[PDB]
Design a binder for this molecule. Structure first.
Ligand code: DUP
Ligand code: DUP
Ligand code: DUP
Ligand code: MG
Ligand code: MG
Ligand code: MG
Ligand code: MG
Lengths: 169, 169, 169
């Protein structure tokens, strides 16, 4: 216990490491370089596999910096215990496709990228480099009971059926 | 303990079941058939109610397959302990509305749907059938302390106020 | 133990309080008034700081009411233990920018706002008032093991490398 097995699947892969000593998540490095146009979706390889023990789940989620500064949206992945495959980052460039054109790509600091040779890109296009920290992994314990069908619940609650903004705002 | 009460609210409802033995979440079946246009939002009924015990929360979240293959975005729901109402799936078709037209709907495998009779749809429109697994439920334990206002914290940390991409990328 | 330190950073800040007795999250009050145009992104100040103890993470996430009724999308924040800075709400108005114009803003109940003096707004624009509950905070325990590189995992699983809709739909 108190150890997690990690396998690197290629030379493009880098070991997860958490920022601060008491930090929740282990920052994830991209194992490939990808340009994403507006509204373009993709699964980004990390070339990294883990072995989360039973009774736990992994949360492959976004970082506050990247997600707040750019239009790169990462759908939080639920990494099952026993999944030994390549961790994929479920991502979308949710920048609107307004049909505009530029010569500058954006990095994940939302800074314009200057290249020697000039190409035409769709506005709002991003580039992710191999080795950049675009995500992180947080492991939490789960409760996994056997399900039992009932006609009525054992105990009545104060909440009942209240939902979706019932307490208001 | 080690059991969760589940109530089926109609004949359209189906019991949650998890895929693998050590899997984190219980796949959720839609209890209705719905077509969603681009940018259309909805709450999808499961006709299923649960009784998560105190000290736990339910995460009504997305599946990797559906979310990565389609523009169907599910906002992760936080199912409170004691909520005995109908579990609703908070969903949006975030496909852009470009005013294009087609005769093919898409399923949640993003495959074109062929019908005998031909209708005109907005491009990027999806159809969810009753009985399809569009989501899953993961239960985790929560910490629920009493709050105490302070002027200063008891212990100084290494992180302090650092946030939003402070460690960089 | 069983207590969480909370610091209010200004007179605009309000103490987090959970809705029901067994509720998972503590509703978060905005400490500022902001208008968000379509596709506009921002980090919204709460002027509130907490001291989550080691072994835990905070989930600064959305409410079902606001998120389902409006186009205001909150990216779930992972609040590290030891972070004593101002809690920021990572938000985007994902309403499409169709270049339409109106005289009515929308509140976070998606109701049209009537003002004495009439201004022109982009359609799909929202207004968040100081003091409104736009988010909530749920704290869960985390597992934080030391990482160990391996060439192969200790135990073979039933899942293996199966992922992204492998069980189908
Ligand atoms: O996606 C969801 C989210 C929540 N729910 C249920 C469970 C939850 O207990 C209830 C409300 O959860 P929230 O407290 O997170 N939303 P809100 O604060 O707007 O509702 P309320 O005012 O009643 O607390 O609605 C769903 O059915 N689906
Ligand atoms: O929505 C959020 C997310 C995070 N935070 C805070 C808490 C968290 O401890 C801090 C940074 O969290 P992350 O590590 O997930 N983001 P990032 O990796 O970009 O920042 P840093 O480089 O400092 O770790 O910012 C917020 O205030 N709101
Ligand atoms: O973002 C993700 C999400 C999941 N995964 C992995 C881990 C997880 O164990 C696997 C599938 O997770 P889900 O069960 O949540 N998705 P789905 O139900 O569509 O796949 P499957 O049918 O195999 O269970 O894919 C990723 O690599 N990245
Ligand atoms: Mg970080
Ligand atoms: Mg969008
Ligand atoms: Mg699954
Ligand atoms: Mg609530």
């Amino acid at each position: 216990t108190n150890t997690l097995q990690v396998k690197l699947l290629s030379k493009n892969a880098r070991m997860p490491e958490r920022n601060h000593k008491t930090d929740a998540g282990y920052d994830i490095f991209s194992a490939e370089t990808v340009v994403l146009e507006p509204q373009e979706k993709a699964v980004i390889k990390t070339d990294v596999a883990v072995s989360i023990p039973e009774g736990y789940v992994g949360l492959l989620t976004s970082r506050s910096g990247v997600s707040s500064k750019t239009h790169l949206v990462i759908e939080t992945g639920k990494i099952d215990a026993g999944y030994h495959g390549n961790l994929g980052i479920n991502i979308k460039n949710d920048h609107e496709d307004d049909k505009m054109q530029t010569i500058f790509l954006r990095n994940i600091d939302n800074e314009k990228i200057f290249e020697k040779e000039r190409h035409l890109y769709k506005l709002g296009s991003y580039r992710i480099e191999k080795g950049e920290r675009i995500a992180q992994l947080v492991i939490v314990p789960i409760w996994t009971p056997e399900l039992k069908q009932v006609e009525e619940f054992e105990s009545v609650s104060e909440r009942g059926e209240k939902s979706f903004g019932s307490s208001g705002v």
